[PDB]
Amino acid sequence: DFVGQTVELGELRLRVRRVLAEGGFAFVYEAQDVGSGREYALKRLLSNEEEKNRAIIQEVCFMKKLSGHPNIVQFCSAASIGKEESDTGQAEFLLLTELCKGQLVEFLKKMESRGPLSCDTVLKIFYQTCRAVQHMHRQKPPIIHRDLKVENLLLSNQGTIKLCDFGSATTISHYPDLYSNFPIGEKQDIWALGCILYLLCFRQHPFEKYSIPPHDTQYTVFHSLIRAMLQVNPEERLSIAEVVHQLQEIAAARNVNPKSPITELLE
Amino acid sequence: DFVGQTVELGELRLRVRRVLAEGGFAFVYEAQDVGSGREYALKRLLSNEEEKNRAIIQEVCFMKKLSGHPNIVQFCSAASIGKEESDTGQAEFLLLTELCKGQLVEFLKKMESRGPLSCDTVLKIFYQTCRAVQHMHRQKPPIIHRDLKVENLLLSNQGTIKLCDFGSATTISHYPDLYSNFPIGEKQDIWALGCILYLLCFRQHPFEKYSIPPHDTQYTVFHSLIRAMLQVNPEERLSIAEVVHQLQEIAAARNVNPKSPITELLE
Ligand SMILES: O=C1NC(=O)c2c1c(-c1ccccc1)cc1[nH]c3ccc(O)cc3c21
Ligand SMILES: O=C1NC(=O)c2c1c(-c1ccccc1)cc1[nH]c3ccc(O)cc3c21
């Protein structure tokens, strides 16, 4: 019962059109700036606790830092209203970002009945997702996502993948700006990406030991990258640069621009 | 069975004299540089996991950032050795700091049999501890300790309080260097400090609702600060600047330099 309201956010005046997503912490809404007609995703996060406050501001900071990359949703603005000032009786945080076309799974559902995904489509989806995570892992210190899953991936208005969910992410604070090149979590993200790749090819989750279908002749080109990302030993497991590198070579060999629109999800 | 060993740490060569503290993650040792004869605390942290790696490096970063303050142990150096190179079969992190005289509780035990602590001694111990936490809360972003307890407090060679345990601490990463003055955890630290003050005066923990003794004529000057730090509502609860400010005025009124040595713990 928050839809219908027009909300002030800086110099913006936004009509809350409908509910895109919910869960525990928060809701996300489709919103439209009344005057300019531009559309946005608006996440509204309620807090009664300083621990919630900290998690919420950390998510905003991560979104701010990662913005600008073609495969991360664009951060537009953020703002709050004190609990004394809201009709929740709670602190409200407002986070305004790029409105996407929808969740990637919705589109995968619809493609699915028309049969397996083209190798090329799998390549584009996976590369674009790996580029977004590479962007996080390249930060100083690296930002570890920790909740990579296909359901959280979005498809942008241009048909490219957009990573949006930084509420589980973490890294080192007050990092000095002495020597250190230690893994601090990246490799759990890679495992997660391995599951996504498996899932895109074979349309099930590799766990709940895994198994690439023994006679698969369509996604064979991905098999060794899958196994490499699903090494149980994390030192053996690939880095994101090791995954991206291989994805670039696969792309160059198939004459595919892997950052291009995934127009087959848009038909 | 790590005591006896001489360990290399940069250009330092340190003899591991004995075990000061242990627990889960780690051990802390008394160590002596063979050549210069200077003494240190040496914490050795074992890791088989990237999550442990991250927690460990975060503790080191916090120690680095907070160093220089008279009431935080001084960070001297840090270093690692890969799991392939150690006789644990695990990554080892070495953290070298100021060797203190001992834990504050040891000294409190010994004072205790000689009767209540002077108001002045309570003032010095509490102020000095609050100055260390103020130093954390003043960082940008603020560093939240989250495990303030009297057992973790140390007494320095000069007779002043030294805070050392930053393994539970946290704050916001990739903080932008837009507006925000939200509590993110400070107030739970203040509650913890309130318990410490109560404990120093009345030699028991206020919980496991609390109760300042109804006829106390010795620590009356602290009573309203206690209640103020133990507000159940965290917006009502004082900030560290609000606590330190009052402690300065109490000190000025009793003609006490509250940062001076606590020479009565040293008799
Ligand atoms: O930024 C977003 N743009 C979006 O379109 C979007 C966003 C987010 C989102 C927004 C802020 C933080 C985390 C997720 C969640 C979202 N769940 C969604 C569910 C359906 C949908 O069409 C879009 C989103 C969505
Ligand atoms: O830095 C320290 N100097 C110390 O004297 C010290 C330190 C620490 C410590 C060191 C690194 C990280 C966290 C705690 C723990 C410690 N437990 C201790 C227990 C007894 C003691 O006499 C000293 C310490 C001690």
Numbering used by the authors:
A (entry chain A), B (entry chain A): 27 to 203, 234 to 264, 275 to 333
Any passages from the paper?
GAK (cyclin G-associated kinase) is a member of the NAK (numb-associated kinase) family, which in humans also includes STK16 (serine/threonine kinase 16)/MPSK1 (myristoylated and palmitoylated serine/threonine kinase 1), AAK1 (adaptor-associated kinase 1) and BIKE [BMP2 (bone morphogenetic protein 2)-inducible kinase]. It is essential for clathrin trafficking, mediating binding of clathrin to the plasma membrane and the trans-Golgi network, and regulating receptor signalling by influencing trafficking downstream of clathrin-coated vesicles. In addition to its role in the cytoplasm, GAK has important functions in the nucleus. It is required for the maintenance of proper centrosome maturation and progression through mitosis.
The asymmetric unit of the primitive monoclinic P21 crystals of GAK–NbGAK_1 contained two molecules of the complex, whereas the GAK–NbGAK_4 complex crystals exhibited a C-centred monoclinic C2 lattice comprising only one complex in the asymmetric unit. The GAK–NbGAK_4 complex showed a similar dimeric arrangement as observed in the apo structure with large portions of the activation segment and the αG helix (residues 265–274) disordered. In contrast, the rather surface-filled CDRs of NbGAK_4 favour the shallower flat binding cavity created by helices αH and αI. The dimeric assembly of GAK is a phenomenon not only observed in the apo form, but also in the crystals of the GAK–NbGAK_4 complex. The hydroxy group at the other end of the carbazole core interacts with the Cys126 carbonyl atom via a water molecule.
